[model samples]
Target: ELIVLNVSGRRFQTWRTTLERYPDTLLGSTEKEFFFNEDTKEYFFDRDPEVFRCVLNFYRTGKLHYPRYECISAYDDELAFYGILPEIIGDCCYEEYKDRKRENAERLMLSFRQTMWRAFENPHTSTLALVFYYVTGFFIAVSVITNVVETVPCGTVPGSKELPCGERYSVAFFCLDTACVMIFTVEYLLRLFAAPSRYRFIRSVMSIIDVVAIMPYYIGLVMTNNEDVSGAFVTLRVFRVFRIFKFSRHSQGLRILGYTLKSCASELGFLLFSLTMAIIIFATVMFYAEKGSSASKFTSIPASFWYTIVTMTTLGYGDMVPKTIAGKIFGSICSLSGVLVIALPVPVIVSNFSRIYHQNQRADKRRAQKKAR
Candidate 1:
């Protein structure tokens, strides 16, 4: 089969661009591409010898040299008969990882909370991701359980609805949930320290939720003495659903889906911009239209925007309504706008899927050819 992949030259250019953008954090490679991630507090320079070389070459020449193999006897078994290599020169090649071997293997293994957080690096998954997944999931489960608990009218906390499971059960669940969220809070603090890139890590989707879900709980921990203080914090527990998205790396399909999004960036962007404009115009009109009729509801442009977005998105829970003709028009237009927004991304999604499909088909064909030989 034909081994088609980016040549060293192309690899160099890609790494060079990365190094240039992050000069403080990344080191260029003339022999290979290496990234020194301050965020992870780790250096790739010693780990991968040739990364910088390729990166530097591309930056210098606008061309990359293909990667070179060591050609050592230890690698011989791995490098043999590229009969397709016979076609090219008729033969071929190719690596374990450091973290696999360690002196404190058992203790590190048990406490190994790293969780493989390297979001982009396909080869080395961080210990952080591995640990964070279970820890975070455990917190979310506790939160859900706690939610069921606090919702019960225990008579211990004011403003709580009633408890069917009895006061003891309600109290138990509340305590458990509070405990889990506190654990999550600690996890968040540790992550602030663990993050490879301070800015990127904090801004990360998971990091944001980790803070959101736990912050309210912390507030309740301090000011509120009511037994159900953690109950309100558990409401943000729903944000934990995002953690499931973080697990997408486990699936090949999701990875391809991500690639497809990158490939369809332009079209997806146009769809978003169109929807944004529609919402903006409708929101503005509704603001002016409802100024007299329902000043309390749509008193200002920004205030009316919440309803505008809700209406336009077609999520008509009907909690909010239009009291005037212009406001009504805004709702109607937003409803219709949904159709355009829906239609716009279809082609882009389809195109990327088609591209992915064909690429896989070509790969299958090449494998078949090699097998025949």
Candidate 2:
């Protein structure tokens, strides 16, 4: 082993050539003179010369072979360089390899189940969202199937054969649609059961999605379903299309979209009010213009509504035609304006909604922090 030598007011050099010049007097002509620094009051190196020589060669050249003092001292840098910080080398060499074997065997023997893990410890909001997804998925499946099963064969109605379109649909399907809506009514109740409060469900975007998807079904029940009623209200059934939010990666988008929709409810209401006024005004105008013509469909205000509604939406189902030139001109004006009516509110609603969301986030943060504090 290398040893320390001490000298008074003297520095020790690793090289014997430099150290030898000053050390004979310092050594006091004795073989072992390396001791304390007398002037600086600090200790220094003293050792057997042969061992010191070997250690010096090992330090300088990295060529000396010596018996090991510690297993770690042998491989300290090698271990550290390879990221072995502790006795974890044993973990890498044996324990971890064994662990991988155990993991593979466990996978073969037992399948991991995450559903309980998910639902059990999940955030209440996320669980609510999951349930809402199920609810809407249920609706899409029901609605699509309801529509398909209700598909009536062509030319089943009187004069339907003469017309290009004729299909016999089911009133039973309407009843089935009502039943499908009841599933959501049941789900709403279940949400109340699962949530901390019923207000949470009411405030949730998923809950709103479930509600909106089924509203038109119940709303249609208020209207009379005459042959004319199909043209008047069949479009409302398209609300069921919202149910696709269940399957897609749409949680955030759906929430944002829902908030956008809710924020524009007043604008939407104004649009509806305007639409109703225009429908009444235009239908009256069309009725007067076509009163002398053979078109009885536009002869009465109520009868003219189908023509007015379909034309104003630009759908132009063509079931009721305006015979007079004046009526046709009015219908054309309504159809052209219908494009603007449909397009204007969407972008305004979407843009204004970003503010509503940020406000909601800020409010939520304040509420949480207040509670925390």
Candidate 3:
């Protein structure tokens, strides 16, 4: 037996041979000198006396038990720090502690996964989820409307074409924008943290939209505080419209439309190319034919291209028209070709869209049927 003096000046009597058996631990290792004043014969250590009792008990009986009035993790941390094998600590309380830890971890994973689904996938599963969707959805709509309201023309008394962003309204808009940013920020973090595939989530198009939705508010906050910057900072607010994409997660119709459009992108690209070529050809012909009669609007082929596009799209803004006989003849042919150009691609896109829409509807119904069964 040996008498030891702890850092707190408490004395503990423990079996000397019990500690000598495990020669690798802090107190057990005799290779190091730990006693003070050889005649006095008391080993000294700078550790808690109460904690040392638990460690001492392990050395005496070769069994570890959780210390009363102490946290398991905290006690386990102390054991690890003191070179004790945590794995050897076994008992009914220890098993219960481990079980509690496992259950808590599983609950955390489940909660995070649910938040991810509600924020970035379907919100139709529960009333709480639906409320989350509508609350955020309402803010998204208000964000878009506020953006449009900013662009409306105020009277020329101040800046021309500028809306009255007076102190009161500016403060109100800022507060609303800040509130939206807070909601989106929490939603973004929850989705990111809960994502099973972080790389895929970060690179997804919707995830990108989620990031863009809140970034502008933060950027504007920083820029608006500085007086040296140009009004370019205001342009960042226009990106708020991207927030509307958040609604696409909840809308089955928008999902189907997006999928169909993606599938038909190759065909749409070809149609766009054909339209470009037709515009160039018609504009060049009109320039040469009308330059002599209407040099004002048809000064060059590039300028005539604008008129050509307006006529081709059937917009017919009536801002520019061909006056001469040769120019008028080409205009008639251009208008006639525009009808064919637009109509040729309509049936293909419509058919693909309809097919995919029905496919998704059928799949949803099958899922419902299965759940019912």
Candidate 4:
């Protein structure tokens, strides 16, 4: 005899003897009579259709297999609802089911922590992440602008020589600067709390920047009461310039520049060595070449280095011009060679920058495609 079990609009038909195998369950017992449709000869249960499929097969095949993707709690509850013993779950999925439940519990426990960490760490992960990214970048810009504009002199003190002076500043910029620092501190502590590896994150360049950027202000605050630290105020305030590098978190160009400088370190060192050797050679020669000129400032080889640097770098300040013809020719030659020496490693460095730029752009395109997908 055939029986139909309509489970929440999905129909399944099997022999009555199949369900009768498990006579203790709802479907197997006469209690199923409550759900029976007298006219259609079908038993309808308002339950999960997918889970019901597994239960129905358990009766027909005399085996209870774990549905891997189903929520373990929901599976356990549904099985409990049917009055079936969990011991009947086959050995094949038994070990896996236990493992799955353990993992599921741990996932539920740490899911929020992991989510907040990801959103803070990567901007492309979610809309909220993008907002966090932009907001932090914005606050960084505000702080850097505050740092620069704070140094603009408010009013001149008596007898102070005005040579594009950096003497005075406003208290208003100080208040704004303090607010931005507080905001930055809030974000940093939140990120630190959510970070998976606290020690490693604290040691990272970006994290160090966060601490260094704010350290100057706090240092000034701590030392402000003492009269000796007025000069220290300028020294500490100068460190606020590092706050500008905070934008590297949001800017791809700055990141590329970092990589370029990293990879070209050897080339840069070589350029420095060449310039040092040329400066030594030219300055020593210029010292002797202009020895006869009374007005010449190249009295010592060390003293001639300043003129050599100015001429070689093409600054030509004219503050220490060579009066003799021999030294004049030497200056022109030094300038010509200076261009060549500095130019030698520039092309390779620029090529590295271009390579990194294209590589980053290509990776960005690939990442966007994946996110879209």
Please report, in order, the local distance difference test score of every candidate based on alpha carbons: 0.55, 0.58, 0.76, 0.83
Question: Which residue pairs show backbone clashes in model 2?
Answer: 4-45, 4-46, 5-44, 5-45, 5-46, 6-35, 8-38, 152-168
Whichever of 1 and 3 has more TM-score, that candidate is 3
In model 3, what is the error at residue 142, expressed in angstroms? Answer: 1.6
Query: Could you tell me every candidate's TM-score relative to the true structure?
Result: 0.39, 0.39, 0.64, 0.63
- Give per-residue lDDT, candidate 4, residue 370: 78
- What are the runs in model 1 whose C-alpha is more than 4 Å off? 1-242, 294-296, 354-373
Residues 1-373 of candidate 1 have per-residue lDDT tens digits of 2111133223222433444542422243232233334453333233233444533444456443334444222222222211111111112211111222231242222123243334323322556555666666666665665555554554544467544553447466567756876776765666676566779988776576556656655555565555556556455445534434433434557667777988888888888788778777877887777778733588778787788778766788776688777668767887787766767789769878887867766677877787799
List the candidate numbers ranked by TM-score, top first. Answer: 3, 4, 1, 2
lDDT per residue as tens, model 3, 38-138: 56476665566677777777788777667556655566666776788766777744777676557445433367675655555666667777787788788
After superposing candidate 3, which stretches have Cα over 4 Å from the reference? Answer: 1-120, 153-168, 225-231
Tally clashing residue pairs in candidate 4. Answer: 0
Worst 10 residues of 3 by lDDT: 159-168
Where does candidate 2 stray beyond 4 Å?
1-194, 198-250, 352-373
lDDT, model 2, position 69: 34
Please report the TM-score between candidate 4 and the true structure.
0.63
- Residue-level lDDT of model 2, residues 1-373, one tens digit each, is 1223432223334544433433323332334334454453334443333333333343455333332232323344333332323333232244544455464444333122344334423435466656766655667677666665454354545654532221243555656677777875775556555565567658977678767776777677666565345666757756666655543333555666666787678889988887888888888888888888653666588888888889877787888987778987998887877676766677788677777667567767877788899
Find the 10 residues in a row with the least total lDDT in model 4. Answer: 161-170
Residue 368, candidate 3: alpha-carbon lDDT: 80
Compare the candidates by TM-score and give the number of the best one: 3
Q: What is the lDDT of residue 47 in candidate 2?
A: 32
Candidate 1 lDDT at 312 equals: 67
